[PDB]
Structure 1
């Protein structure tokens, strides 16, 4: 005897969802605290953040020409030295000045520092995304150098 008169398939769906959620809560309650919190919140959250950032934002590999231009990361922890080839995720509204400040930690940067991609110098009042689109399409490798000349 499938179905009952007066009851709706939507009510059945609601009841089934309630059953599933109650069973999930029971199974989460009767579980190890060492594993469940991690496997249910911390790995999903990190995976979600990483995937969303990768599939939504757009990143650039940053290099610096000379060692004397490297920033001072001695104080901040978990990164005590600059490494070239660093992946940096940015927003579509970011400019070259904002990128430079983010690199040098909002501190006094060297003089006549400029950004290039594939040998082509960017203006400081230029959008990084559009400048890359124009000069180095699908090759976002940026280089910070000193323009004395």
Structure 2
């Protein structure tokens, strides 16, 4: 005897979802504290953040010409030293000045510092996204150098 009169398939769907959620709560309660919180919240959350950031934002590999132009990262923790090739995720509205400040930690940068991509110098009042689209399409490797000349 499939189905009952006066009852709707949508009501049955609600019933089923309630059953599933109650069972999930029971199984989460009767589980190890050591494993369940990690496996249910921290790995999903990290994976979500990473995948969303990669699939949505757009990033750039940043290099610097000379060691004298490297930033001072001695004080901030988990990164005591600059390394070239760092992947850096930015927003579409970011400019070269904002990028430079982000690199140098809101501190006094050196003089006549400029950004290039495939040999092509960027203006500082330029959107990084459009500048890359123009000069280095699908090769976002940026380089920071000193333009004395």
Q: TM-score, normalised to structure 2's length?
A: 1.00
Q: Deviations over 1:62-107 (max 9, x none)?
A: 0000000000000000000000000000000000000000000000
* 2:78 alignment counterpart: 78
- RMSD (Å), alpha carbons: 0.1
Displacement of 1:10 after TM fit?
Answer: 0.1
1:51-71 CA distance string (max 9 Å, x none): 000000000000000000000
Give unpaired runs (5+ residues) of structure 2.
Answer: none
Work out the CA distance in 2 between the residues paired with 1:125 and 1:84: 24
Q: Distance in 2 between matches of 1:115 and 1:36?
A: 47
Residues 24-65 of structure 1: CA distance to partner in whole angstroms, max 9, x if unpaired? 000000000000000000000000000000000000000000
* Alpha-carbon shift at residue 8 of structure 1 (Å): 0.1
Give the C-alpha shift of residue 112 in structure 1.
0.1
Q: What is the number of residues matched between the two proteins?
A: 149
Q: Secondary structure at the match of 1:35?
A: helix
* Dislocated runs of 4+, deviation >6 Å: none
TM-score under structure 1 length normalisation = 1.00
Distance 1:124 1:59 in 2: 18
